[PDB]
Amino acid sequence: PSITTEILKSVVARFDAGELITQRELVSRQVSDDLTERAATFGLILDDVSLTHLTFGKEFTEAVEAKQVAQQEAERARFVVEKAEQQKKAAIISAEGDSKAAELIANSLATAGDGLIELRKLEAAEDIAYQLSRSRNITYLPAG
Amino acid sequence: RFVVEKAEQQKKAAIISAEGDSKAAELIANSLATAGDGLIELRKLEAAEDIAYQLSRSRNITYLPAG
Amino acid sequence: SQLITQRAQVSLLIRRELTERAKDFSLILDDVAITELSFSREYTAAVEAKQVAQQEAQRAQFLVEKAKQEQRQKIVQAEGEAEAAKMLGEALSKNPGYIKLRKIRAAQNISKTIATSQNRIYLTADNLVLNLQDESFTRGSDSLI
Amino acid sequence: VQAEGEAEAAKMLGEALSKNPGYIKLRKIRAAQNISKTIATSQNRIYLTADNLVLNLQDESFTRGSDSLI
Amino acid sequence: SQLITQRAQVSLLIRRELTERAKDFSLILDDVAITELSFSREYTAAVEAKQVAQQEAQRAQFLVEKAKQEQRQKI
């Protein structure tokens, strides 16, 4: 109950978490050396020294999981970029439609004037009043 | 010290992101220097529609008239 | 730090001193072991926070990898916007009337979106153009002369 | 370290925005959109101006955006 | 990633070292199988989100097809 404990705790203090996990064999071998040396003086002999379980604190494990999640999100960013390329194609097509529409309307209104805009404003006022008429969450207040 | 190491990685990431921002700004500046700001007005209208849609499901958003 | 990282040497020092003191009482020490060695709650939390910060610094390396993709995404989006601006600005330079028409349509669209929304909306009654005696009644028509 | 990053960013970004700062405006629009998403599911109480809905077509400011394009 | 995509090689390594260690106790290993290999909730969710993003990138291709029709409608 004493020697083992101390020896183990004395060897784990030689390594950090990364070394403890990725060099588990070296840690076990050093624990075995120390424990064999100490137990020889009590007439005992060790047939096997094994580090069977090795974990860390809650917060540290959360931090490690967050690091690996960040790696996965970096991987996901590539598919976000592919979506962005498709979005660029779609935006260019839609903008070509918008630009053709703007050219047509500009040619018309350069010589015609903005009468259509006023008429559309009145028709849209009627339509918008109709759209909002069924909503109880819409209130109309006078100007000011 | 580990906060400083995180800061160094953040500096690298900030430089890369700012390179992207600067290339984007160069492209858009070249386009708009001759085209004008029509795209900005169109995007404002489209964003008005989109933002109205985004906020439509929230009961904690209220619209009040100007003033 | 010394206590944790020199546990064996601390134990040996304790054993030497304890042997010297126990000889006077005719006692023999066969072994001395530091079985437990822990610290306060606050110090343990601070040590854990330091190691969490180390893991966060290691996590920040993947933010650079994500930043590369974000850079590419920004450039792609800007290329699309630059092309769109190029073609739309020439059309709108002659007459920006399309914007106005588009704006009207936007309003209509928004109205639909707002009809079924969960929001509380307080609109101005001027939207209803019901005050026919207002001085602003003729503004729209007056703008056409 | 942070200032080194910021200075490196500022050099190129300001060189780009000197010709035309329009990117900022576009970026701003996108920011608004992003914020809207963030605000949709938020726990805050938000009181916005109904001017965001561009529903007052007879308002004198209706033509401001288009008028700025002449 | 290596654990999942090299499960057979990891199993062979485990079997080799386990054979060497079990020889000392007069034990014979007939087979070693990694029957389960899973990760935390957060990592699994991140992987699923990455693949969802891949499917979203594939979905964005149809938004171009829709944009063509929207262009025609605008005109």
Numbering used by the authors:
A (entry chain C): 120 to 263
B (entry chain B): 197 to 263
C (entry chain b): 151 to 295
D (entry chain a): 226 to 295
E (entry chain c): 151 to 225
Copy out sentences from the published article reporting this entry, exactly as the authors wrote them:
Stomatin, Prohibitin, Flotillin, and HflK/C (SPFH) family proteins are found in all kingdoms of life and in multiple eukaryotic organelles. SPFH proteins assemble into homo- or hetero-oligomeric rings that form domed structures. Most SPFH assemblies also abut a cellular membrane, where they are implicated in diverse functions ranging from membrane organization to protein quality control. Here, we report single-particle cryo-EM structures of the endoplasmic reticulum (ER)-resident Erlin1/2 complex and the mitochondrial prohibitin (PHB1/2) complex, revealing assemblies of 13 heterodimers of Erlin1 and Erlin2 and 11 heterodimers of PHB1 and PHB2, respectively.
The PHB1/2 complex resides in the intermembrane space (IMS) of mitochondria, where PHB1 and PHB2, which are 50% identical at the sequence level, are each anchored in the inner mitochondrial membrane via an N-terminal transmembrane helix. 3D classifications of our cryo-EM dataset revealed two main conformations of the PHB1/2 complex: a ‘closed’ conformation determined to an overall resolution of 2.4 Å, and an ‘open’ conformation, determined to an overall resolution of 3.1 Å, that showed increased gaps between the SPFH domains of PHB1/2 heterodimers. In comparison, our ability to distinguish between and accurately model PHB1 and PHB2 clearly revealed an arrangement of 11 heterodimers of PHB1 and PHB2, with the CT of PHB1 extending inwards towards the center of the cage and the CT of PHB2 extending outward. The closed and open PHB1/2 complexes both have a height of ~110 Å and a diameter of ~85 Å at the narrow end of the cage. The diameter of the wide end of the closed PHB1/2 complex is ~190 Å, and that of the open PHB1/2 complex is ~196 Å. In the closed PHB1/2 complex, adjacent SPFH domains interact primarily through hydrogen bonds. Most of these interactions occur between β8 of one SPFH2 domain and ɑ3 of the neighboring subunit. The closed PHB1/2 complex also exhibits an extensive hydrogen bonding network between the β6-β7 loop in the SPFH2 domain of each subunit with the CC1 helix of the subunit in the clockwise direction, when viewed from the top of the cage. The narrow end of the PHB1/2 cage forms a four-layered structure, like the Erlin1/2 complex. After the β9 layer, the CTs following β9 of the 11 PHB2 subunits each turn back towards the outer edge of the cage, while the CTs following β9 of the 11 PHB1 subunits extend inwards towards an ~18 Å-wide central channel.
